[PDB]
Every structure is written in structure tokens, then in C-alpha cells.
Design an enzyme around this catalytic site. Structure first.
Site, PDB file in Angstrom:
ATOM      1  N   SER A 148      72.291  47.998  -0.303  1.00  0.00           N
ATOM      2  CA  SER A 148      71.508  46.770   1.131  1.00  0.00           C
ATOM      3  C   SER A 148      70.285  45.812   0.610  1.00  0.00           C
ATOM      4  O   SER A 148      70.053  45.984  -0.748  1.00  0.00           O
ATOM      5  CB  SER A 148      71.530  47.806   1.836  1.00  0.00           C
ATOM      6  OG  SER A 148      70.746  48.888   1.649  1.00  0.00           O
ATOM      7  N   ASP A 200      73.754  51.179  -7.817  1.00  0.00           N
ATOM      8  CA  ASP A 200      73.474  51.076  -6.678  1.00  0.00           C
ATOM      9  C   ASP A 200      72.505  52.680  -6.203  1.00  0.00           C
ATOM     10  O   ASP A 200      72.997  53.792  -6.116  1.00  0.00           O
ATOM     11  CB  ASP A 200      74.631  51.352  -5.457  1.00  0.00           C
ATOM     12  CG  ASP A 200      73.861  51.718  -4.189  1.00  0.00           C
ATOM     13  OD1 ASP A 200      73.179  51.387  -3.630  1.00  0.00           O
ATOM     14  OD2 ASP A 200      75.261  51.850  -3.111  1.00  0.00           O
ATOM     15  N   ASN A 251      69.144  44.779   4.050  1.00  0.00           N
ATOM     16  CA  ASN A 251      68.405  44.870   4.903  1.00  0.00           C
ATOM     17  C   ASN A 251      66.768  46.215   5.163  1.00  0.00           C
ATOM     18  O   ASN A 251      67.105  47.303   4.669  1.00  0.00           O
ATOM     19  CB  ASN A 251      68.536  45.166   6.160  1.00  0.00           C
ATOM     20  CG  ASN A 251      69.965  43.342   6.917  1.00  0.00           C
ATOM     21  OD1 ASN A 251      70.842  43.297   6.408  1.00  0.00           O
ATOM     22  ND2 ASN A 251      69.670  42.715   7.758  1.00  0.00           N
ATOM     23  N   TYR A 264      77.180  50.644   7.321  1.00  0.00           N
ATOM     24  CA  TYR A 264      76.968  51.317   5.211  1.00  0.00           C
ATOM     25  C   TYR A 264      78.402  52.630   4.864  1.00  0.00           C
ATOM     26  O   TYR A 264      78.795  52.545   5.646  1.00  0.00           O
ATOM     27  CB  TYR A 264      75.928  52.151   5.275  1.00  0.00           C
ATOM     28  CG  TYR A 264      74.692  51.625   5.622  1.00  0.00           C
ATOM     29  CD1 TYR A 264      73.935  50.653   4.497  1.00  0.00           C
ATOM     30  CD2 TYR A 264      73.587  51.919   6.479  1.00  0.00           C
ATOM     31  CE1 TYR A 264      72.883  50.779   4.484  1.00  0.00           C
ATOM     32  CE2 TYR A 264      72.377  50.947   7.163  1.00  0.00           C
ATOM     33  CZ  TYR A 264      72.339  50.541   6.099  1.00  0.00           C
ATOM     34  OH  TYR A 264      70.757  48.896   6.076  1.00  0.00           O
TER      35      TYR A 264
END
Lengths: 6, 326
Positions: free
Chosen positions: B35, B215, B37, B75
């Protein structure tokens, strides 16, 4: 557990 | 060179402490390469998860600048809505001034309630950032706060100290041999091609290549439900009474490596990494999940894989570097 963004 | 120590929670989640505001209010955030943010809980939030985590109070910061824009982020596990604000974020000894972040308004559900971290600091590309909000590492680079437009991650095993994110540098202490470099295929997630997944010289999945993301914010090895069901049969995993995919603990001794071939280089994951020791029994480190994109259905090279391989995320050349941990 965790699977982090679509 | 600038390091952020990360706490390892049960080999499932890796988070560190950041400071937001003047004076700094402290939060724990997952450093998430899946992600883009940054957000933390705020005083505007009255969800259950906001009541038992640290909450940003914008009234108490002399450097807070408000906006009239909102952010919503979904998510694989968890979701939030917030308002975007600007403040100084202290991350890995870097004072990242004029950083746009989300202050949560709602954090619905039980997942964020039970989680030990307050927020998420996303480390992926700007093109997947909700409300187009500048990611932390983009804002650090744009302000010339580092010299090398890369960061690198070492994730520890067996609940040990030592996990680190290194901003603007590599530490060769952490790996053996030389870094192999893999081109990013699509600039959103840290997305790469996996040439094949093999066991005993036979392709068990992704026989003619597949797309995978690297990830740090995913615990397990994730892929489409159908190839994953095949992998579960191959490693002798059956669905237990409580939904869990279990394998006999004795069997770690007799299972072969599963090999991810990436850019013609073999990356073996041993059975002592891909079978997890959890609450007295042994579970599969493979999880079934469909994420369809423009470029097919994604695999996730989660924490199971990253623990085995020191990972460098290079934004100057749009490459990922991998080398076996020392």
C-alpha cells in the site's frame, strides 16, 4: 493474519 | 544512513514507531510495501479500534495543516475512512516535513481492534495511493532527505529482534553473495514476474510465469484459489475443524523445497519456512486469495518469503533486489 491495498 | 527498527509480532506482523506533529505524538505503524498511504487513528474516530489505539490529536501540534479532503482505503484485512492533513513525520531518523497523511474517522470491524499496531505506512508506488496522497518515501526523496532513492528490508524469524527498514541504503551485513536485480513489471505494487513455482523439478503452479507482488504487509504466501488448492494437496495439508489448513508437524523433516524461479534465478523456500508453528500445531504458509488486475491474478510474496530473502526496493531504477539472508 495480515493482507495489507485492494 | 537511516534505520528504523521493527518489532516482530509472532512472525505475522512487523511494525515500528513513528512520530507525527510538533511535539511528536508516537504511533506504531506496519511498514507496508503493499500500500502507499500513511494513516493513523485520530480524535475524530469513535470506532472500537480507535478507542484502544493511540489517536492523533491535531489541536496539540504546532505544525498541523488541515485539508477539506478525505481518504478511504480497503485492505485484504481491514479498512478505514479519514480526512487528509499535513504534518511532520519522524521516520527512521528522517524529519519528513509537510507529509500528507490520513487521520481516521472510521475503522470498522474486529481486525483493527485486536491488531497491536495503530496505523499503516505504505511503501509502494503513488499510482495506487488513495486520493492521490503523496506516499512517505516519495515525499522523503522529493525533499532531498536521502541520497539513494531506495530502501531495504530485513525481517527477522522466530519472534527475534533485529528486523529493520533501511531508508536510502543497503547494509551488506544482512545478506550473503551479491544482490540479484528483478525489473518491476507494473509500477503500483512492487510487482515482478515469477517464472515458475517448482517442487522436485515439476511445476506445481505458474508453469508459464505469473505476476507476484513483494509485500512486507502480507503474512503468508498468497495466490489464486485454484493453484493454491493444488499446492495444499502437494504438501499434505487438509482443512481442519476450525477452517485452518493443517499439516503434520513430523512431516517438515520429509518435505522438499518449493522453488520460486525469478528472472532465471532459483529462490527455494524450505518446509521449515513454508510450514508455520502455531498454537501447538503446524499450519500451511499458503493462503488462497484472488486479486484480479489489468495484468492477471496476483500472487503475494509475503513475510514467509521475505524472511528468507533480504529485499531492496529501488525507486531510481524500478527494480527489486533479492539475496539470501545471512
Amino acid at each position: 493474519x495480515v493482507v495489507x491495498a485492494x | 544512513v537511516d534505520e528504523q527498527p521493527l518489532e516482530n509480532y509472532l512472525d505475522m506482523e512487523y511494525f515500528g514507531t513513528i512520530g507525527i506533529g510538533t511535539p511528536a505524538q508516537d504511533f506504531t505503524v506496519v511498514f507496508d510495501t503493499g500500500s502507499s498511504n500513511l494513516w493513523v487513528p485520530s480524535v475524530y474516530c469513535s470506532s472500537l479500534a480507535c478507542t484502544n489505539h493511540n489517536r492523533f490529536n491535531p489541536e496539540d501540534s504546532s505544525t498541523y495543516q488541515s485539508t477539506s479532503e478525505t481518504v478511504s482505503i480497503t485492505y485484504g484485512t481491514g479498512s478505514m475512512t479519514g480526512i487528509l492533513g499535513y504534518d511532520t513525520v519522524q521516520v527512521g531518523g528522517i524529519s519528513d516535513t509537510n507529509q500528507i497523511f490520513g487521520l481516521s474517522e472510521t475503522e470498522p470491524g474486529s481486525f483493527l481492534y485486536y491488531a497491536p499496531f495503530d496505523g499503516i505506512l505504505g511503501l509502494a508506488y503513488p499510482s495506487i495511493s488513495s486520493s492521490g496522497a503523496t506516499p512517505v518515501f516519495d515525499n522523503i526523496w522529493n525533499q532531498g532527505l536521502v541520497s539513494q532513492d531506495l530502501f531495504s528490508v530485513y525481517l527477522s524469524a522466530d519472534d527475534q529482534s533485529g528486523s529493520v527498514v533501511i531508508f536510502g541504503g543497503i547494509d551488506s551485513s544482512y545478506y550473503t553473495g551479491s544482490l540479484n536485480w528483478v525489473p518491476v513489471t507494473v509500477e503500483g505494487y512492487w510487482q515482478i514476474t515469477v517464472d515458475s513455482i517448482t517442487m522436485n523439478g515439476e511445476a506445481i503452479a505458474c508453469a508459464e510465469g505469473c505476476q507476484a507482488i513483494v509485500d512486507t504487509g502480507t503474512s503468508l504466501l498468497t495466490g489464486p484459489t485454484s493453484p493454491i488448492a493444488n499446492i495444499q494437496s502437494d504438501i499434505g495439508a487438509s482443512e481442519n475443524s476450525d477452517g485452518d489448513m493443517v499439516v503434520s508437524c513430523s512431516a517438515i523433516s520429509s518435505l522438499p523445497d518449493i522453488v520460486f524461479t525469478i528472472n532465471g534465478v532459483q529462490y527455494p523456500v524450505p518446509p521449515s519456512a513454508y510450514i508455520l508453528q502455531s498454537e501447538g500445531s503446524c499450519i500451511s504458509g499458503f493462503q488462497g486469495m484472488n486479486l484480479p488486475t489489468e495484468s492477471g491474478e496476483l500472487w503475494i510474496l509475503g513475510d514467509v518469503f521475505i524472511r528468507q530473502y533480504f529485499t531492496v526496493f529501488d525507486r531510481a531504477n524500478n527494480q527489486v533486489g533479492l539475496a539470501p539472508v545471512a
